[PDB]
Amino acid sequence: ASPSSELRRALEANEFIPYYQPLSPGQGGRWIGVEVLMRWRHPREGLIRPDLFIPFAERSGLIVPMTRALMRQVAEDLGGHAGKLEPGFHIGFNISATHCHELALVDDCRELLAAFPPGHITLVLELTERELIESSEVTDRLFDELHALGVKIAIDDFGTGHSSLAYLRKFQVDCLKIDQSFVARIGIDTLSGHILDSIVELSAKLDLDIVAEGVETPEQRDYLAARGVDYLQGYLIGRPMPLESLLSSLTVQEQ
């Protein structure tokens, strides 16, 4: 048995499915976007979450075709339902380091955007700080071309001092993620609060949007809103859901 060939078989069989996790405004109201998460609907094992297979897919060299198929599925799922998405609706993907080392990502982005009316959605790609520090002329050109399409870049796993500020400024990143681990310690740990404030401070300095992850309680939501955090996701807003469930909820909010 070859794990690599099994991943290829699964991709051919359309077993990698988009799940959609809603994003809510910090101050509440109708969803302003979704973050797309790749699940494996395995016929024997059931539904497998991406942390259990994406790292291996990256090692195998298959992550880019998998992400491409995901982006194509999203276009087919949502391109016909623009009337249920308020103009400017965010669609987010986690992009692998290898995908950032190639210019094909620009074509992949252009294609997804063409499935919606012009300007109707905002595509958001989520990267790590490593992709900015370990950058080349290819990176410069990629981000430039993505930005000209109207694509936004969100960064996780970043430092908040002057060193990190230089990278974020050079590449004109658009958003910062607050990791769930910080959100979970709201009201429990003073240091975590100080870290969270440092992230908010860096965002203010560079005029970045902030997305907070793992928002599970009204306390957490209110704490984050008080600091002007733009977007929230987590159990309080909703778990990642299949298309059928997303369309049902969007129909309701369209009210």
PDB file of C-alpha atoms in Angstrom:
ATOM      1  CA  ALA A   1       0.000   0.000   0.000  1.00  0.00           C
ATOM      2  CA  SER A   2       1.145   3.528  -0.899  1.00  0.00           C
ATOM      3  CA  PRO A   3      -0.232   6.434   1.129  1.00  0.00           C
ATOM      4  CA  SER A   4       0.728   8.739  -1.765  1.00  0.00           C
ATOM      5  CA  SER A   5      -1.273   6.672  -4.321  1.00  0.00           C
ATOM      6  CA  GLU A   6      -4.239   6.548  -1.867  1.00  0.00           C
ATOM      7  CA  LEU A   7      -4.225  10.367  -1.683  1.00  0.00           C
ATOM      8  CA  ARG A   8      -4.213  10.478  -5.522  1.00  0.00           C
ATOM      9  CA  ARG A   9      -7.095   7.928  -5.629  1.00  0.00           C
ATOM     10  CA  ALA A  10      -9.107   9.974  -3.144  1.00  0.00           C
ATOM     11  CA  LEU A  11      -8.565  13.208  -5.170  1.00  0.00           C
ATOM     12  CA  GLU A  12      -9.613  11.450  -8.372  1.00  0.00           C
ATOM     13  CA  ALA A  13     -12.689  10.114  -6.536  1.00  0.00           C
ATOM     14  CA  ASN A  14     -13.696  13.618  -5.283  1.00  0.00           C
ATOM     15  CA  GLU A  15     -13.380  12.627  -1.619  1.00  0.00           C
ATOM     16  CA  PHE A  16     -11.866  15.982  -0.580  1.00  0.00           C
ATOM     17  CA  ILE A  17     -14.838  18.193   0.290  1.00  0.00           C
ATOM     18  CA  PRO A  18     -15.086  21.861   1.264  1.00  0.00           C
ATOM     19  CA  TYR A  19     -16.510  22.596   4.699  1.00  0.00           C
ATOM     20  CA  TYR A  20     -17.472  26.193   5.324  1.00  0.00           C
ATOM     21  CA  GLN A  21     -16.853  27.936   8.641  1.00  0.00           C
ATOM     22  CA  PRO A  22     -18.718  31.211   9.034  1.00  0.00           C
ATOM     23  CA  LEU A  23     -17.085  34.549   9.909  1.00  0.00           C
ATOM     24  CA  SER A  24     -19.053  37.088  11.914  1.00  0.00           C
ATOM     25  CA  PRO A  25     -18.449  40.821  12.457  1.00  0.00           C
ATOM     26  CA  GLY A  26     -16.892  41.679  15.827  1.00  0.00           C
ATOM     27  CA  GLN A  27     -20.008  43.745  16.626  1.00  0.00           C
ATOM     28  CA  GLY A  28     -22.366  40.937  15.462  1.00  0.00           C
ATOM     29  CA  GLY A  29     -24.843  40.726  12.570  1.00  0.00           C
ATOM     30  CA  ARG A  30     -25.078  38.598   9.479  1.00  0.00           C
ATOM     31  CA  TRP A  31     -22.058  36.525   8.446  1.00  0.00           C
ATOM     32  CA  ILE A  32     -19.511  38.486   6.366  1.00  0.00           C
ATOM     33  CA  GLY A  33     -17.696  35.427   4.997  1.00  0.00           C
ATOM     34  CA  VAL A  34     -16.566  31.862   5.289  1.00  0.00           C
ATOM     35  CA  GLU A  35     -13.284  30.083   5.735  1.00  0.00           C
ATOM     36  CA  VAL A  36     -13.053  26.959   3.589  1.00  0.00           C
ATOM     37  CA  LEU A  37     -11.576  23.889   5.226  1.00  0.00           C
ATOM     38  CA  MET A  38     -10.674  20.713   3.320  1.00  0.00           C
ATOM     39  CA  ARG A  39     -12.200  17.515   4.778  1.00  0.00           C
ATOM     40  CA  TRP A  40     -11.677  13.960   3.523  1.00  0.00           C
ATOM     41  CA  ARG A  41     -14.943  12.076   3.288  1.00  0.00           C
ATOM     42  CA  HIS A  42     -13.403   8.680   3.463  1.00  0.00           C
ATOM     43  CA  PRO A  43     -15.837   5.834   2.695  1.00  0.00           C
ATOM     44  CA  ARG A  44     -14.518   3.594   5.524  1.00  0.00           C
ATOM     45  CA  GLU A  45     -13.062   6.004   8.128  1.00  0.00           C
ATOM     46  CA  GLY A  46     -15.737   8.693   7.760  1.00  0.00           C
ATOM     47  CA  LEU A  47     -15.037  12.383   7.783  1.00  0.00           C
ATOM     48  CA  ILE A  48     -11.363  13.202   8.452  1.00  0.00           C
ATOM     49  CA  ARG A  49     -10.210  16.726   9.401  1.00  0.00           C
ATOM     50  CA  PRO A  50      -7.285  18.405   7.508  1.00  0.00           C
ATOM     51  CA  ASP A  51      -4.789  18.410  10.405  1.00  0.00           C
ATOM     52  CA  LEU A  52      -4.796  14.594  10.071  1.00  0.00           C
ATOM     53  CA  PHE A  53      -3.753  14.448   6.375  1.00  0.00           C
ATOM     54  CA  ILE A  54      -2.635  17.810   4.965  1.00  0.00           C
ATOM     55  CA  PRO A  55       0.875  17.548   6.394  1.00  0.00           C
ATOM     56  CA  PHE A  56       1.318  14.230   4.703  1.00  0.00           C
ATOM     57  CA  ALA A  57      -0.224  15.562   1.428  1.00  0.00           C
ATOM     58  CA  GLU A  58       2.374  18.354   1.512  1.00  0.00           C
ATOM     59  CA  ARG A  59       5.202  15.830   1.917  1.00  0.00           C
ATOM     60  CA  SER A  60       3.712  13.723  -0.907  1.00  0.00           C
ATOM     61  CA  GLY A  61       3.709  16.717  -3.296  1.00  0.00           C
ATOM     62  CA  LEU A  62      -0.130  16.620  -3.815  1.00  0.00           C
ATOM     63  CA  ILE A  63      -1.202  19.600  -1.760  1.00  0.00           C
ATOM     64  CA  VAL A  64      -1.395  22.002  -4.700  1.00  0.00           C
ATOM     65  CA  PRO A  65      -3.684  19.819  -6.908  1.00  0.00           C
ATOM     66  CA  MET A  66      -5.822  19.151  -3.814  1.00  0.00           C
ATOM     67  CA  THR A  67      -6.169  22.876  -3.037  1.00  0.00           C
ATOM     68  CA  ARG A  68      -6.893  23.593  -6.706  1.00  0.00           C
ATOM     69  CA  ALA A  69      -9.715  20.992  -6.726  1.00  0.00           C
ATOM     70  CA  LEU A  70     -11.050  22.544  -3.503  1.00  0.00           C
ATOM     71  CA  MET A  71     -11.104  26.052  -5.046  1.00  0.00           C
ATOM     72  CA  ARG A  72     -12.890  24.647  -8.121  1.00  0.00           C
ATOM     73  CA  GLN A  73     -15.488  22.912  -5.941  1.00  0.00           C
ATOM     74  CA  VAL A  74     -16.123  26.183  -4.049  1.00  0.00           C
ATOM     75  CA  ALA A  75     -16.760  27.973  -7.338  1.00  0.00           C
ATOM     76  CA  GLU A  76     -19.238  25.298  -8.367  1.00  0.00           C
ATOM     77  CA  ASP A  77     -20.902  25.312  -4.909  1.00  0.00           C
ATOM     78  CA  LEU A  78     -21.322  29.080  -4.495  1.00  0.00           C
ATOM     79  CA  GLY A  79     -20.907  30.779  -7.937  1.00  0.00           C
ATOM     80  CA  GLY A  80     -24.617  30.229  -8.718  1.00  0.00           C
ATOM     81  CA  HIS A  81     -25.786  31.707  -5.348  1.00  0.00           C
ATOM     82  CA  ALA A  82     -24.378  35.257  -5.423  1.00  0.00           C
ATOM     83  CA  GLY A  83     -27.834  36.655  -4.493  1.00  0.00           C
ATOM     84  CA  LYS A  84     -27.408  34.959  -1.047  1.00  0.00           C
ATOM     85  CA  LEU A  85     -23.998  36.621  -0.473  1.00  0.00           C
ATOM     86  CA  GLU A  86     -23.893  40.323   0.375  1.00  0.00           C
ATOM     87  CA  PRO A  87     -21.360  42.135  -1.827  1.00  0.00           C
ATOM     88  CA  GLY A  88     -17.840  41.901  -0.372  1.00  0.00           C
ATOM     89  CA  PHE A  89     -18.444  38.408   1.176  1.00  0.00           C
ATOM     90  CA  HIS A  90     -15.104  36.905   2.242  1.00  0.00           C
ATOM     91  CA  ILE A  91     -14.005  33.473   1.016  1.00  0.00           C
ATOM     92  CA  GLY A  92     -10.897  32.230   2.825  1.00  0.00           C
ATOM     93  CA  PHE A  93      -8.441  29.406   2.061  1.00  0.00           C
ATOM     94  CA  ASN A  94      -5.387  28.071   3.898  1.00  0.00           C
ATOM     95  CA  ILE A  95      -2.592  28.091   1.401  1.00  0.00           C
ATOM     96  CA  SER A  96       0.377  25.785   1.778  1.00  0.00           C
ATOM     97  CA  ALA A  97       3.994  26.995   1.629  1.00  0.00           C
ATOM     98  CA  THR A  98       4.604  25.081  -1.638  1.00  0.00           C
ATOM     99  CA  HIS A  99       1.570  26.831  -3.295  1.00  0.00           C
ATOM    100  CA  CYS A 100       3.259  30.197  -2.511  1.00  0.00           C
ATOM    101  CA  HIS A 101       6.437  29.147  -4.282  1.00  0.00           C
ATOM    102  CA  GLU A 102       4.580  29.024  -7.674  1.00  0.00           C
ATOM    103  CA  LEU A 103       2.809  31.645  -9.815  1.00  0.00           C
ATOM    104  CA  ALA A 104      -0.078  29.241 -10.721  1.00  0.00           C
ATOM    105  CA  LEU A 105      -1.815  30.412  -7.581  1.00  0.00           C
ATOM    106  CA  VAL A 106      -2.599  33.684  -9.433  1.00  0.00           C
ATOM    107  CA  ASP A 107      -4.440  31.726 -12.152  1.00  0.00           C
ATOM    108  CA  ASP A 108      -6.253  29.661  -9.480  1.00  0.00           C
ATOM    109  CA  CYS A 109      -7.378  32.892  -7.775  1.00  0.00           C
ATOM    110  CA  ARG A 110      -8.390  34.585 -11.062  1.00  0.00           C
ATOM    111  CA  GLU A 111     -10.492  31.480 -11.904  1.00  0.00           C
ATOM    112  CA  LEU A 112     -12.356  31.371  -8.612  1.00  0.00           C
ATOM    113  CA  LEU A 113     -13.112  35.118  -8.800  1.00  0.00           C
ATOM    114  CA  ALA A 114     -14.486  34.753 -12.362  1.00  0.00           C
ATOM    115  CA  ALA A 115     -17.185  32.414 -10.990  1.00  0.00           C
ATOM    116  CA  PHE A 116     -18.818  35.383  -9.217  1.00  0.00           C
ATOM    117  CA  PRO A 117     -19.899  38.813 -10.425  1.00  0.00           C
ATOM    118  CA  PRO A 118     -16.960  41.238 -10.562  1.00  0.00           C
ATOM    119  CA  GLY A 119     -16.024  42.486  -7.074  1.00  0.00           C
ATOM    120  CA  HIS A 120     -18.850  40.488  -5.433  1.00  0.00           C
ATOM    121  CA  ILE A 121     -16.514  38.405  -3.181  1.00  0.00           C
ATOM    122  CA  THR A 122     -13.201  38.995  -1.420  1.00  0.00           C
ATOM    123  CA  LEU A 123     -10.789  36.108  -1.664  1.00  0.00           C
ATOM    124  CA  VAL A 124      -8.522  35.791   1.394  1.00  0.00           C
ATOM    125  CA  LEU A 125      -5.432  33.556   1.461  1.00  0.00           C
ATOM    126  CA  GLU A 126      -3.991  32.539   4.810  1.00  0.00           C
ATOM    127  CA  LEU A 127      -0.261  32.105   5.123  1.00  0.00           C
ATOM    128  CA  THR A 128       2.359  31.928   7.858  1.00  0.00           C
ATOM    129  CA  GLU A 129       5.015  34.491   8.650  1.00  0.00           C
ATOM    130  CA  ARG A 130       7.603  31.955   7.426  1.00  0.00           C
ATOM    131  CA  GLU A 131       6.381  32.491   3.800  1.00  0.00           C
ATOM    132  CA  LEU A 132       7.366  36.222   4.139  1.00  0.00           C
ATOM    133  CA  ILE A 133      10.731  35.681   5.835  1.00  0.00           C
ATOM    134  CA  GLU A 134      11.666  32.822   3.470  1.00  0.00           C
ATOM    135  CA  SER A 135      10.792  34.877   0.419  1.00  0.00           C
ATOM    136  CA  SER A 136      12.336  35.429  -3.036  1.00  0.00           C
ATOM    137  CA  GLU A 137      11.617  37.380  -6.238  1.00  0.00           C
ATOM    138  CA  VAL A 138       8.865  34.850  -6.938  1.00  0.00           C
ATOM    139  CA  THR A 139       7.128  35.830  -3.640  1.00  0.00           C
ATOM    140  CA  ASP A 140       7.357  39.543  -4.497  1.00  0.00           C
ATOM    141  CA  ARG A 141       5.781  38.942  -7.894  1.00  0.00           C
ATOM    142  CA  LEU A 142       3.096  36.565  -6.527  1.00  0.00           C
ATOM    143  CA  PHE A 143       1.835  38.930  -3.836  1.00  0.00           C
ATOM    144  CA  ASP A 144       1.906  41.882  -6.245  1.00  0.00           C
ATOM    145  CA  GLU A 145      -0.189  39.975  -8.808  1.00  0.00           C
ATOM    146  CA  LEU A 146      -2.598  38.622  -6.134  1.00  0.00           C
ATOM    147  CA  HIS A 147      -3.085  42.098  -4.711  1.00  0.00           C
ATOM    148  CA  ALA A 148      -3.904  43.441  -8.221  1.00  0.00           C
ATOM    149  CA  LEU A 149      -6.682  40.827  -8.433  1.00  0.00           C
ATOM    150  CA  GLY A 150      -8.120  42.186  -5.152  1.00  0.00           C
ATOM    151  CA  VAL A 151      -6.992  39.106  -3.163  1.00  0.00           C
ATOM    152  CA  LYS A 152      -6.218  39.729   0.486  1.00  0.00           C
ATOM    153  CA  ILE A 153      -3.467  38.065   2.532  1.00  0.00           C
ATOM    154  CA  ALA A 154      -3.926  36.953   6.135  1.00  0.00           C
ATOM    155  CA  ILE A 155      -0.948  35.955   8.264  1.00  0.00           C
ATOM    156  CA  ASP A 156      -0.668  33.575  11.231  1.00  0.00           C
ATOM    157  CA  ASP A 157       2.259  32.581  13.513  1.00  0.00           C
ATOM    158  CA  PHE A 158       3.845  36.039  13.476  1.00  0.00           C
ATOM    159  CA  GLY A 159       5.947  38.179  15.818  1.00  0.00           C
ATOM    160  CA  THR A 160       4.640  41.584  16.875  1.00  0.00           C
ATOM    161  CA  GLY A 161       7.852  43.607  17.161  1.00  0.00           C
ATOM    162  CA  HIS A 162       9.708  45.879  14.685  1.00  0.00           C
ATOM    163  CA  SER A 163      11.392  42.876  12.971  1.00  0.00           C
ATOM    164  CA  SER A 164       8.062  41.299  11.981  1.00  0.00           C
ATOM    165  CA  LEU A 165       6.587  44.718  11.201  1.00  0.00           C
ATOM    166  CA  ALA A 166       9.174  45.100   8.392  1.00  0.00           C
ATOM    167  CA  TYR A 167       8.003  41.929   6.605  1.00  0.00           C
ATOM    168  CA  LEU A 168       4.327  42.774   7.010  1.00  0.00           C
ATOM    169  CA  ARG A 169       4.951  46.252   5.622  1.00  0.00           C
ATOM    170  CA  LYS A 170       7.101  45.081   2.686  1.00  0.00           C
ATOM    171  CA  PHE A 171       4.500  42.595   1.480  1.00  0.00           C
ATOM    172  CA  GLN A 172       1.494  44.809   2.361  1.00  0.00           C
ATOM    173  CA  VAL A 173      -0.309  42.001   4.229  1.00  0.00           C
ATOM    174  CA  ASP A 174      -3.995  42.723   4.879  1.00  0.00           C
ATOM    175  CA  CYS A 175      -5.013  40.756   7.970  1.00  0.00           C
ATOM    176  CA  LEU A 176      -3.639  39.157  11.120  1.00  0.00           C
ATOM    177  CA  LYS A 177      -5.115  36.018  12.805  1.00  0.00           C
ATOM    178  CA  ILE A 178      -5.470  35.778  16.623  1.00  0.00           C
ATOM    179  CA  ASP A 179      -4.746  32.122  17.398  1.00  0.00           C
ATOM    180  CA  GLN A 180      -7.409  30.167  19.317  1.00  0.00           C
ATOM    181  CA  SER A 181      -4.879  29.519  22.098  1.00  0.00           C
ATOM    182  CA  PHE A 182      -4.938  33.212  23.076  1.00  0.00           C
ATOM    183  CA  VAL A 183      -8.715  33.519  22.781  1.00  0.00           C
ATOM    184  CA  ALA A 184      -9.179  30.510  25.038  1.00  0.00           C
ATOM    185  CA  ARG A 185      -7.254  32.231  27.847  1.00  0.00           C
ATOM    186  CA  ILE A 186      -9.345  35.483  27.785  1.00  0.00           C
ATOM    187  CA  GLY A 187     -10.179  36.391  31.374  1.00  0.00           C
ATOM    188  CA  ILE A 188      -8.071  33.601  32.820  1.00  0.00           C
ATOM    189  CA  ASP A 189      -4.424  34.593  32.040  1.00  0.00           C
ATOM    190  CA  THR A 190      -3.035  38.163  32.223  1.00  0.00           C
ATOM    191  CA  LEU A 191      -0.004  37.473  29.985  1.00  0.00           C
ATOM    192  CA  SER A 192      -2.266  36.064  27.243  1.00  0.00           C
ATOM    193  CA  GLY A 193      -4.244  39.324  27.450  1.00  0.00           C
ATOM    194  CA  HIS A 194      -0.999  41.314  27.008  1.00  0.00           C
ATOM    195  CA  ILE A 195      -0.104  39.200  23.947  1.00  0.00           C
ATOM    196  CA  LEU A 196      -3.563  39.715  22.500  1.00  0.00           C
ATOM    197  CA  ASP A 197      -3.215  43.489  23.067  1.00  0.00           C
ATOM    198  CA  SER A 198       0.154  43.432  21.242  1.00  0.00           C
ATOM    199  CA  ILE A 199      -1.473  41.818  18.216  1.00  0.00           C
ATOM    200  CA  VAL A 200      -4.185  44.502  18.294  1.00  0.00           C
ATOM    201  CA  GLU A 201      -1.521  47.194  18.572  1.00  0.00           C
ATOM    202  CA  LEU A 202       0.462  45.902  15.560  1.00  0.00           C
ATOM    203  CA  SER A 203      -2.781  45.776  13.507  1.00  0.00           C
ATOM    204  CA  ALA A 204      -3.534  49.430  14.406  1.00  0.00           C
ATOM    205  CA  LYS A 205      -0.054  50.491  13.408  1.00  0.00           C
ATOM    206  CA  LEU A 206      -0.307  48.924   9.929  1.00  0.00           C
ATOM    207  CA  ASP A 207      -4.077  49.333   9.519  1.00  0.00           C
ATOM    208  CA  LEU A 208      -4.715  45.600   9.247  1.00  0.00           C
ATOM    209  CA  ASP A 209      -7.917  43.647   9.730  1.00  0.00           C
ATOM    210  CA  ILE A 210      -7.977  41.077  12.567  1.00  0.00           C
ATOM    211  CA  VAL A 211      -9.719  37.690  12.546  1.00  0.00           C
ATOM    212  CA  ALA A 212      -9.981  35.949  15.956  1.00  0.00           C
ATOM    213  CA  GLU A 213     -10.160  32.127  15.993  1.00  0.00           C
ATOM    214  CA  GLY A 214     -11.845  29.823  18.540  1.00  0.00           C
ATOM    215  CA  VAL A 215     -14.441  32.207  19.830  1.00  0.00           C
ATOM    216  CA  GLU A 216     -16.626  30.002  21.995  1.00  0.00           C
ATOM    217  CA  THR A 217     -18.155  32.308  24.648  1.00  0.00           C
ATOM    218  CA  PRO A 218     -19.966  35.656  24.847  1.00  0.00           C
ATOM    219  CA  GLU A 219     -17.197  36.841  27.219  1.00  0.00           C
ATOM    220  CA  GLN A 220     -14.598  36.185  24.540  1.00  0.00           C
ATOM    221  CA  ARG A 221     -16.748  37.829  21.830  1.00  0.00           C
ATOM    222  CA  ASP A 222     -17.297  40.945  23.937  1.00  0.00           C
ATOM    223  CA  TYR A 223     -13.601  41.207  24.916  1.00  0.00           C
ATOM    224  CA  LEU A 224     -12.572  41.014  21.277  1.00  0.00           C
ATOM    225  CA  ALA A 225     -15.268  43.492  20.103  1.00  0.00           C
ATOM    226  CA  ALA A 226     -14.116  45.933  22.802  1.00  0.00           C
ATOM    227  CA  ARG A 227     -10.688  45.945  21.123  1.00  0.00           C
ATOM    228  CA  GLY A 228     -12.128  46.481  17.616  1.00  0.00           C
ATOM    229  CA  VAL A 229     -11.422  43.009  16.291  1.00  0.00           C
ATOM    230  CA  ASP A 230     -13.001  42.910  12.862  1.00  0.00           C
ATOM    231  CA  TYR A 231     -14.039  39.292  12.390  1.00  0.00           C
ATOM    232  CA  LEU A 232     -14.767  36.312  14.653  1.00  0.00           C
ATOM    233  CA  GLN A 233     -14.946  32.581  14.100  1.00  0.00           C
ATOM    234  CA  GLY A 234     -15.434  29.667  16.455  1.00  0.00           C
ATOM    235  CA  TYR A 235     -18.142  27.547  18.012  1.00  0.00           C
ATOM    236  CA  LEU A 236     -20.118  30.595  19.082  1.00  0.00           C
ATOM    237  CA  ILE A 237     -20.494  31.611  15.437  1.00  0.00           C
ATOM    238  CA  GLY A 238     -20.631  28.126  14.010  1.00  0.00           C
ATOM    239  CA  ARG A 239     -18.695  24.966  13.284  1.00  0.00           C
ATOM    240  CA  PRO A 240     -17.420  24.171   9.771  1.00  0.00           C
ATOM    241  CA  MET A 241     -20.415  22.893   7.853  1.00  0.00           C
ATOM    242  CA  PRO A 242     -21.245  21.160   4.585  1.00  0.00           C
ATOM    243  CA  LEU A 243     -22.659  23.147   1.657  1.00  0.00           C
ATOM    244  CA  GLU A 244     -26.283  22.076   2.260  1.00  0.00           C
ATOM    245  CA  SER A 245     -26.131  23.548   5.803  1.00  0.00           C
ATOM    246  CA  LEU A 246     -24.413  26.723   4.632  1.00  0.00           C
ATOM    247  CA  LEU A 247     -27.034  27.356   1.928  1.00  0.00           C
ATOM    248  CA  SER A 248     -29.826  26.817   4.475  1.00  0.00           C
ATOM    249  CA  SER A 249     -28.335  29.422   6.837  1.00  0.00           C
ATOM    250  CA  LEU A 250     -27.583  31.916   4.079  1.00  0.00           C
ATOM    251  CA  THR A 251     -31.167  31.600   2.869  1.00  0.00           C
ATOM    252  CA  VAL A 252     -32.387  32.568   6.326  1.00  0.00           C
ATOM    253  CA  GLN A 253     -30.006  35.559   6.674  1.00  0.00           C
ATOM    254  CA  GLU A 254     -31.128  36.794   3.224  1.00  0.00           C
ATOM    255  CA  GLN A 255     -34.582  37.385   4.920  1.00  0.00           C
TER     256      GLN A 255
END
